[PDB]
Write a protein that binds this ligand. Sequence first.
Ligand SMILES: O=C(O)[C@H]1O[C@@H](O)[C@H](O)[C@@H](O)[C@@H]1O
Length: 302
Amino acid sequence: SWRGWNIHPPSYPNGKALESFAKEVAEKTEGRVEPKVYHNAVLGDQPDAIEQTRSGALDFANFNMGPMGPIVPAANVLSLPFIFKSPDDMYRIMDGEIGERFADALAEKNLIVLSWFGSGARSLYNTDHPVETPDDVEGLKVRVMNNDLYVQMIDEMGGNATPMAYGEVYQSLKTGVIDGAENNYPSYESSGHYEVANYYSLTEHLILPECLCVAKASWEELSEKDRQAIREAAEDAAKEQRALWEEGVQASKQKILDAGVKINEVDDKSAFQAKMQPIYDQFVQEHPELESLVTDIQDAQS
Ligand SMILES: O=C(O)[C@H]1O[C@@H](O)[C@H](O)[C@@H](O)[C@@H]1O
């Protein structure tokens, strides 16, 4: 018996892929390993679940790499704004040697990465006006996930930020406690945020991988043959997740458009990116040992 964690609903692309993984694992191990996925963060918010998985209280999970940054230093590289040019670049990079360096870093903190899920690009949405240039972010209080890099990101754009659990964002928008947040289409849609924050502006400022990972303790207990089988199941599940993801993005977009959401491309994404320089400079000064990881990712997209 394995318990697994997903923050999203069962029908979200990630949810479907995880159920496929769970089935394939049970089938390939002849019932020796029987994973059960707990969706909707039933077993805790993301930071607490990461903790429970490191200690082996939870057996597997789909984590966004953003919240992984405060736990695994190398993972913070993935939260540098605009580090990836597109999700396709991110997939190519994460499926190759650079992705292995991230897996190595997570393993040191007791998480065994089996495959990488996509989460598109995250963009700003708010209740007040289209964002066309960085100066339009002035005056907006924007929710971010709990990584200091995201507060720095919003601050450099011109606004102000506040870290908050995903589950709380909807009501916080409804009550006016925050003016906006940022995410991909499927989250913006499935969470209901689009019902309150009607302006979605395509900053596409973060392209965050997500892992499908196992507690090191749970991993080590297995036979060698079952590890090989579960690794295969995870790879198949990620392939499925990425296919479901593309469809899901288009379906979510059409739904929010039909609902009257105002979507705008920004004037010039490079103007937002240029403002991020101090973030990169400070990062590589703090972490000289991670500088070559930053430059290797940048260089791999020329
Ligand atoms: O903004 C957030 O908290 C959420 O964003 C979504 O894109 C991620 O898939 C989910 O893991 C995060 O919890």
